[PDB]
Design an enzyme around this catalytic site. Structure first.
Site, PDB file in Angstrom:
ATOM      1  N   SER A   2      38.766  12.049 -13.925  1.00  0.00           N
ATOM      2  CA  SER A   2      39.576  13.161 -13.523  1.00  0.00           C
ATOM      3  C   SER A   2      39.546  14.111 -14.700  1.00  0.00           C
ATOM      4  O   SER A   2      40.055  13.789 -15.767  1.00  0.00           O
ATOM      5  CB  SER A   2      40.995  12.677 -13.302  1.00  0.00           C
ATOM      6  OG  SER A   2      41.815  13.721 -12.830  1.00  0.00           O
ATOM      7  N   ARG A   3      38.939  15.275 -14.531  1.00  0.00           N
ATOM      8  CA  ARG A   3      38.731  16.149 -15.682  1.00  0.00           C
ATOM      9  C   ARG A   3      39.983  16.847 -16.170  1.00  0.00           C
ATOM     10  O   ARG A   3      40.223  16.895 -17.369  1.00  0.00           O
ATOM     11  CB  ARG A   3      37.600  17.132 -15.439  1.00  0.00           C
ATOM     12  CG  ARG A   3      36.283  16.472 -15.671  1.00  0.00           C
ATOM     13  CD  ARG A   3      35.142  17.430 -15.661  1.00  0.00           C
ATOM     14  NE  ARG A   3      33.978  16.749 -15.103  1.00  0.00           N
ATOM     15  CZ  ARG A   3      32.765  17.282 -15.005  1.00  0.00           C
ATOM     16  NH1 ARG A   3      32.541  18.521 -15.438  1.00  0.00           N
ATOM     17  NH2 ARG A   3      31.774  16.571 -14.468  1.00  0.00           N
ATOM     18  N   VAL A   4      40.781  17.374 -15.247  1.00  0.00           N
ATOM     19  CA  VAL A   4      42.122  17.852 -15.571  1.00  0.00           C
ATOM     20  C   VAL A   4      42.875  16.784 -16.374  1.00  0.00           C
ATOM     21  O   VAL A   4      43.624  17.109 -17.308  1.00  0.00           O
ATOM     22  CB  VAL A   4      42.916  18.202 -14.301  1.00  0.00           C
ATOM     23  CG1 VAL A   4      44.363  18.451 -14.648  1.00  0.00           C
ATOM     24  CG2 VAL A   4      42.302  19.430 -13.606  1.00  0.00           C
TER      25      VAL A   4
END
Lengths: 266, 49, 128
Positions: free
Chosen positions: C119-121
């Site tokens: 999950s980049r966020v």
């Protein structure tokens, strides 16, 4: 189904192959060096256990020592020996256990966690030496009080050929058990300084070195044998995957060409 | 110390000329073996015997 | 979904699935006799997906603060994530959840490959 997969799945096996094929030669160099230690060991034991034969010595709690090593990739050496200890150890669920080499441990640890009171480590590297055989004996006397036992038994693999072996048992007699024998009087042993004490302690060391030397050469023969079957079996997969590789490679060139072709037609 | 182990010290004084101290002599005068007393499962420190 | 986003509310959007939409776009384009590209997909099949998903967004306060979260779904064939369309979409999104048949059968459900899933966020979006 993609080239990358098949090419690297090939690169795992091609090394597995080359490696298993190396340790068959390293196993073969180690073969003679260890056939030699087995000869030197027996010869020493032959001079020592011949006295016990004449004294017709038998056995009037228990200690079991089972010997293999740490390293696998040697077929069923650890397994059917562990199994020989299971067969015998049915008569004695209260026999204390010392294990030599981690593989006989994970075999005997999972079958009987509690009997194992002692375990030895880093064993099957080079051939067994007397120092090993001795200091292991030393601790069997130290914390395991090997002297204070009615019967002692060593478990190890005897090598019959270079293709098969037999899990064997041989007994160890103590200071006391040597004295009260059918024929202690055949020999003019001086009954002064603790002799039976020593002949037991000296034998504890020796009959182990001899069990280990045989267990080692059985192991080394079983390695060169299991690895031969593996390198053979690996090559077979390499052959089957070189063929799949080739199919896929052809398919890749065709499929790429069809896109260029469809693209060109419009 | 015991009769086996005692002999060993007199077999490592006997073992320790560098010229006749061949390769498979230094090997016999060493060991990488750790003893571990196993309770219940496991127990104390593994020590280099 | 944008209406919720454009009016201080929040919407989640599930595209089930984009693999099949890409196939439809391909059918469209070949029958229009527009020259295809790789695997016969239209040359702008990356654009097809990027403009869709750029629209998911967290709007600023001056815009009412609404959001559109997107969970696009892609189907790989034979575990092949290097395939054209799956490679396209991976490059568009803010991370992925890789689901795996081999993990599913070991009795791992959801069959999420933790190593491969990001999950980049990231933690900036996780209750403390």
């Amino acid at each position: 189904a993609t080239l990358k997969e098949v090419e690297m799945r090939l690169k795992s096996i091609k090394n597995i192959e080359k490696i298993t094929k190396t340790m068959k030669i390293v196993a073969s160099t180690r073969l003679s060096k260890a056939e030699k230690a087995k000869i030197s060991a027996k010869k020493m034991d032959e001079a020592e256990q011949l006295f016990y034969k004449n004294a017709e010595t038998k056995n009037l709690k228990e200690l079991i020592v089972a010997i293999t090593s740490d390293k696998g990739l040697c077929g069923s050496i650890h397994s059917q020996l562990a199994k020989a200890v299971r067969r015998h150890l049915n008569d004695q669920p209260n026999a204390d256990i010392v294990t030599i080499g981690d593989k006989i441990k994970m075999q005997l640890l999972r079958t009987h966690p509690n009997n194992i009171k002692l375990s030895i480590n880093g064993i099957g590297k080079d051939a067994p030496t007397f120092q090993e055989s001795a200091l292991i004996a030393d601790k069997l006397l130290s914390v395991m009080k090997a002297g204070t036992y009615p019967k002692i038994s060593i478990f190890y693999n005897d090598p019959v050929s270079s293709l098969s072996f037999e899990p064997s048992e041989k007994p160890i007699f103590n200071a006391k058990t040597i004295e009260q024998s059918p024929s202690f009087g055949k020999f003019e042993i001086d009954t002064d300084a603790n002799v039976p004490r020593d002949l037991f302690e000296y034998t504890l060391a020796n009959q182990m070195l001899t069990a280990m030397a045989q267990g080692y050469a059985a192991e080394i023969s079983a390695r060169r044998n299991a690895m031969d079957n593996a390198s053979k079996n690996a090559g077979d997969m390499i052959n089957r995957y070189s063929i799949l590789y080739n199919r896929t490679r052809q398919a890749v060139i065709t499929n790429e060409l069809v896109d260029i072709i469809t693209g060109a037609s419009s | 110390i015991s009769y086996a182990a005692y002999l060993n010290v007199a077999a490592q004084a006997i073992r320790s000329k560098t010229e006749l101290q061949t390769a498979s002599v230094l090997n016999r005068s060493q060991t990488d073996a750790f003893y571990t007393q196993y309770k219940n499962a496991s127990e104390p420190t593994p020590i280099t015997k | 979904g944008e209406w919720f986003r454009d009016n201080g509310k929040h919407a989640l959007i599930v595209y089930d699935d984009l693999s099949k939409q890409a196939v439809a776009y391909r059918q469209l384009s070949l029958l229009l006799r527009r020259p295809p590209g790789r695997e016969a997909y239209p040359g702008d099949v990356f654009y097809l997906h990027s403009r869709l998903l750029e629209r998911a967004a967290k709007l600023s306060e001056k815009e009412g603060s609404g959001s559109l979260t997107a969970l696009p779904v892609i189907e790989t064939q034979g575990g092949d994530v290097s395939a054209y369309i799956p490679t396209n979409v991976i490059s568009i999104t803010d991370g992925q959840i890789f689901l795996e048949a081999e993990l599913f059968y070991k009795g791992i459900r959801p069959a999420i490959n933790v190593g491969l899933s990001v999950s980049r966020v990231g933690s900036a979006a996780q209750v403390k």
